[model samples]
Target: LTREAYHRLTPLPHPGGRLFIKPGARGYRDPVHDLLQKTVEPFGERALDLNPGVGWGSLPLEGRMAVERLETSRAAFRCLTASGLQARLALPWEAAAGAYDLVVLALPAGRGTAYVQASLVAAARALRMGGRLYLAGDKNKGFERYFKEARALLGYGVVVRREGPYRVALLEKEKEAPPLPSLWRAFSARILGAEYTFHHLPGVFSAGKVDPASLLLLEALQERLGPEGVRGRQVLDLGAGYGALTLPLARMGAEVVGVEDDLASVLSLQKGLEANALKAQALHSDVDEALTEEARFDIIVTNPPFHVGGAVILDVAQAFVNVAAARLRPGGVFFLVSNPFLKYEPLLEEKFGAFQTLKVAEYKVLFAEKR
Candidate 1:
């Protein structure tokens, strides 16, 4: 069966009761799906699938198949299991080393090049000696660069081939790859007159420094909260990259919770919280899933993520706004920062009734109250 046909075979629907494949959708039939179908047959025993999708487990493999994915995006976890595939939510490097006979990386073109490099190193570690690794992606999305880097890292015996606009690489593990430095790093930055150390992992947003939009949001939040205003208030830092907002808010005496969809960001947030000796919770979950009806917050603060991999994804920002409206208590505040061009004002108006906007150079800081 074709990959599209396979995902359709499942009875489970996408989140919000939506169909997995909508009619009249603009799409491409990935050549990597075909490439994986061929590669799986020979090396399917005890296989591991990284960053799995609905079509990723189509093969009726000879032995067991396990998948590692991110739980923060419930859609991905749901997609994998919808096909009756066994999967676990984890970071790229969290999987146990030397367990699988084959590792399949059906990478899409979106998750930036930095993620690709870290995933390759993690994929190499997931395989046993003599195990095979297969990597696939669109040619225009840096597949040739990925292949070249893996070839150098593995030191020997890497093969690359192409089918249409797609590229696939095969690597046989003959020797142990050298150890690489930790993907997590620490740096110090001053936010609102306080010098603080922040931790960051590869692929997390604003890795090396504080994001300017977030910096603007921090200033707005401080002004809104006033002196000793944050004390004992329950707050949330949605899309909290490396605890930039969560840590500082906690320092101001707020009881804070951080929600991030990326596992690397969650880890970095945890490390930063510990570094500051702050008491707060960081959940690696989608904004919608984590904000249940029971989760009432005094304030919700965010610099909502607007991009996935290098592509603009406006729907993510929309979802964040909707969830923020639902989770905040009546009389509570939702403070946000975004690019001035995203035009989130209408949605904010629709949900919260009224919003006050402050333009900080190129960024827009929004303040809205739940009725």
Candidate 2:
């Protein structure tokens, strides 16, 4: 009754023949689905689908499939549960051990290799002694590496099928696998001549290290925030991945709240907040969706995700601009940084009316103030 629900919730269409696909609508599919489509039917019994992923606000698995799906993104997890599937928002390593007849992993792309490796290991762990695993990936997403890791972990594995840019490996859990990888990583960053440790989880942006664009943004903020520019101000760190920007802003005496969609990143951001003994709140949100309706910030800072899963998508970042416009108090400032080519200049002007732009090396930083 997905179609029924879709029509029931959205009775009328808006202008431009557009439909509102809400945040829970995945609207995307992994290539691994194709590889599994051609493979043999091994999903009849008890099984686990790691990040099977939802699309069109529906579960990818068949009805009455007797499968449990776990997803990393809040959006996908919400869609899976709403579709009436047995779904979880659990981390990969937290999956049940030795309970499934089969485990299907549509290896997530654009995540760090360590995260992918941890997923592979987790799949193996969730299987009984004789349970099978169907692992799928394209060459670009380190399919060979996954294949090798699977064979090493599960002992017996072979290519079961191959489809458009994907190879599906069938692995049997004949042997024990190692414990989950150390996903929480640490790196040091010197901000304004003071050193601090930043914690990161695999799959988060800038896993275990800092990046140039954010560094540039921090530098600029440093030059701007002198004695009382941001001290004691309420701050919102939109798209705060691992608290790279949020931690420092909090250190500068701002009451900061960070919003991130990825649970892995959110977890790491929380760890970062605690690691330095800093007081900053991290909310798992889709671009300010989790913020209280009446909440307003004195300043907002972000290095939003413009490129996701190897595709340059402007929808999220565009929504961030709109959200920032409405959430910031009068005269509150917003700062965003992105690579030079991913254009937000027009969107900023459209959303905030007037804004400032700066070029720091290869980065484009945009600034706006709420009126």
Candidate 3:
């Protein structure tokens, strides 16, 4: 109804609308017909900069197109291959659609709202004044609120298409927003008895800066290490979110291993490690996948992820405990810091018999040892 009404009133111009879309990797919500209708028939050309393309499908938009799948996951590589669309690593700014006639910004049902905002700001700048901007997503994706906020930021035009559980908003270009700060710049702090540093790019956890929880964890972890003659022991910082916890560990004479699943965060964490000449190994794999390694570790530490996407799945800390127990040698300990509340005690007690309390401040630190 809205699509037909939009055409009757405004009539998208010749050469079609050049559309950009941020695709979700869930593989379920992709509106094939809707995409084909807008991108194939209406738009003459398209460029999709699929940010964090974990499970995203390729754009089948007809005519000239470019699909740069940034931070694509290994599990979803098959999806990209099956789509038969040539994929490129993230392109330089010059490769983007600075003058695209249309831009599409997309986010999955549960991640990166800030990214959507940042991307749209970029898109708004890239599109011509009379060009169009579109946003689509599922309700589970927090799109309702996002839609409202996007509408507020948009230069002009408004929601032009709505139907059947999905919405497509249309915005005629108005004016561009100022740029966001880069996330890759180095940031440092003195905490937990040593110097900690990170190269945070925006959109990564606390990318614009450091995180308080991880900072607290780092301080508590400092006291946990270098005791029991544990200096120089191998340490694994599971779910090493942005290197906030891992950075301090490396400076304490322990060889550190930082593991993170988010491709963007993993890249940032590695840069953080290298920027300070820290001796560490950084792996871009989920904790489960990383646990498959045969290397034995003396100590494991983490401020494990409490949620996946925007949905709360607080099992990551427990999962880390399970995996760490398997990898840790007898008498080796795991140091963990989380919010004062959250039922990690049972899991810690189960995995590392007789879990001992190392300290309990604003954040709780549990030192669990394998029998």
Models, CA RMSD each: 5.7, 5.1, 10.0
Q: Candidate 2's residue-wise lDDT over 1-371, tens digit each? A: 22123212131232323222343334344456655655735454777887655522113344435687777776555555555557777778789988888888877766868888889888988988888888877887788987898899997899878776778888888998788887777998887676779887788888767778887887777767664577899999988989878888888899999988788888898988888989988988766667768999998888887655343535666667778888888988888898776767777787788888755558877888887
Model 1: per-residue Cα lDDT over 1-371, one tens digit each: 22133223234343323213211111114467556655554564577766555444224352345434323244455554554556676666666788877777766446566677778877788888888777777777887788777666654544455668876678877778556446778999998888889987777788788888888988887787785878899998888879888988999899998887666788889999889888898887655455555888999999987653333435556667777887888999999898776677888898999999865577899999999
User: Which of the two, 2 or 3, has more TM-score?
Assistant: 2
TM-score of each prediction: 0.83, 0.88, 0.68
**Residue 11, model 3, lDDT:** 15
For every model shown, the clashing-pair count is 0, 0, 7
Candidate 2 error regions (>4 Å): 1-27, 37-40, 55-61, 308-313
- Compared with the true structure, what per-residue lDDT tens digits does model 3 show for residues 273-357? 7788886787765464554557778888877766433333253455677777877888787877766666678777777776776
- Candidate 1 global TM-score: 0.83
Any residue pairs clashing in model 1, and if so which?
none
Arrange candidates, best TM-score first.
2, 1, 3
Give residue 49's lDDT in candidate 3 (0 to 100).
41
Q: Which ten contiguous residues of candidate 3 have the minimum total lDDT? A: 3-12
